[PDB]
């Protein structure tokens, strides 16, 4: 590819059929070879499927990189190299004008559906590119052509709908995503189509969305509730954000997040809320219920310590689908 780049550099910067034919066809075979390798690595069912995502790890805080662990993908280095080389092949195909035209021709001559392997590989290059609308269209193409590949389509739609500032369509796609994910448990990521890597990513997605929806100097209370509920995930990393939420509630003093004692299964949450209610965290009026009934409800909930966190978080996600109304901001 780079020998051709030097030779094609010379043939492009300035019939000359040989150079253009080489730059198209040699790239054509190498592009299908590398794309076949990539989609034989990720989503291997076309010849656990893997998906090229964008995980926002810092929810408490041509030159793109894929953050894939060596555990879920032990051959991640050369798979990433093959994806990069095929992306460069596609870029060099569409870069030179004659190469662009006759590559479009040769790809149109074969199955323009791009099957599923080539279609997935196009979705992956486009998501890695930084452009998400053609990625979303290619994922719709997948869904038309197509937890197996439904997990693939939904999770890729989620990461292409995040796209730096949508924050709602991602939530809807992800909510429809766990509907297929039933299990009792900061850059682009490549995670499998299983719960272990998709559930934390989806929860971080909702956490970031509701964090940006909540801390906007407004009086939105439901967003604060969603924020606290999702923050239970991965303690004690959410310590500072919970402290900020407590300070905000002390400033306001009108927390009305009914169904509160149905999702908040954390001892520290309840101890802090009781701290706020006695004299010293202020005298903060808390409508956590849909005087005695309040302490009585906290006494029921301290008895529910444990209650493995993903089960209750998934129950919150599926039962309270009305979170899209607060997600509108």
Q: Are 37 and 79 in contact (CB under 8 A)?
A: yes
Distance of CA 91 to the CA centre of its chain: 25
Indicate the SS3 state at residue 310. helix
Q: Determine the Cα–Cα distance for residues 76 and 287; give it in Å rounded to an integer.
A: 50
Q: Which residues pair with 191 in a beta bridge?
A: 51
Of 25, 182, 172, which is closest to residue 92 (Cα–Cα)? 25
Q: What is the resolution of this structure in A?
A: 7.7
Q: Are 188 and 52 in contact (CB under 8 A)?
A: yes
Q: List the determination method.
A: cryo-EM
Q: What secondary structure letter does DSSP report for 280? A: B
Q: Determine the Cα–Cα distance for residues 158 and 225; give it in Å rounded to an integer.
A: 23
Q: Which residues contact 34 (CB under 8 A, 6 or more apart)?
A: 82, 83, 85, 86, 89
Q: Are 67 and 198 in contact (CB under 8 A)?
A: no
Task: Give the helix ranges, DSSP H, for 58-186.
Answer: 76-95, 97-109, 117-129, 133-145, 148-162, 169-178
Of 130, 121, 220, 204, which is closest to residue 170 (Cα–Cα)? 204
Question: Which strands make up the sheet holding 188-192, listed edge to edge?
Answer: 50-54, 188-192, 66-67
């Amino acid at each position: 590819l780079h020998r051709m780049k030097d030779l094609c550099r010379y043939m492009n910067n300035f019939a000359h059929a040989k150079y253009k034919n080489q730059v198209v066809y040699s790239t054509m075979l190498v592009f299908f070879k590398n794309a076949f390798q990539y989609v034989n690595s990720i989503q291997p069912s076309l010849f656990v499927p893997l998906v090229l995502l964008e995980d926002v790890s810092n929810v408490y805080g041509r030159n793109r990189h894929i953050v894939v662990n060596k555990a879920e993908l032990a051959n991640s280095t050369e798979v990433l190299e093959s994806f990069k080389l095929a992306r460069e092949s596609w870029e060099l195909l569409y870069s030179l004008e004659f190469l662009d035209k006759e590559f479009t021709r040769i790809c149109l001559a074969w199955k323009t559906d791009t099957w599923l392997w080539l279609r997935i590989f196009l979705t992956d290059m486009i998501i890695y590119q930084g452009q998400y609308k053609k990625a979303i269209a290619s994922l719709h193409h997948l869904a038309a052509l197509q937890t197996l590949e439904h997990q693939r389509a939904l999770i890729q739609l989620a990461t292409c709908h995040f796209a730096l500032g949508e924050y709602r369509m991602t939530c809807e796609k992800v909510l429809d995503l766990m509907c297929y994910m039933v299990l009792p448990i900061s850059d682009l990521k490549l995670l499998p189509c299983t719960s272990k890597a998709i559930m934390p990513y989806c929860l971080h997605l909702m956490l970031a969305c509701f964090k940006l929806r909540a801390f906007t100097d407004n009086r939105d209370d439901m967003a604060l509730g969603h924020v606290i509920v999702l923050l239970q995930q991965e303690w004690p990393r959410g310590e500072n954000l919970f402290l900020k939420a407590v300070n905000k509630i002390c400033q306001q003093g009108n927390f009305q997040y009914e169904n509160f004692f149905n999702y908040v299964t954390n001892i520290d949450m309840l101890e802090e809320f009781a701290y706020l209610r006695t004299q010293e965290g202020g005298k903060i009026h808390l409508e956590l219920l849909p005087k005695e009934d309040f302490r009585l409800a906290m006494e029921r909930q301290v008895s529910r310590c444990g209650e493995n966190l993903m089960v209750v978080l998934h129950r919150f996600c599926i039962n309270e689908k009305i979170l899209l109304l607060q997600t509108l901001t």
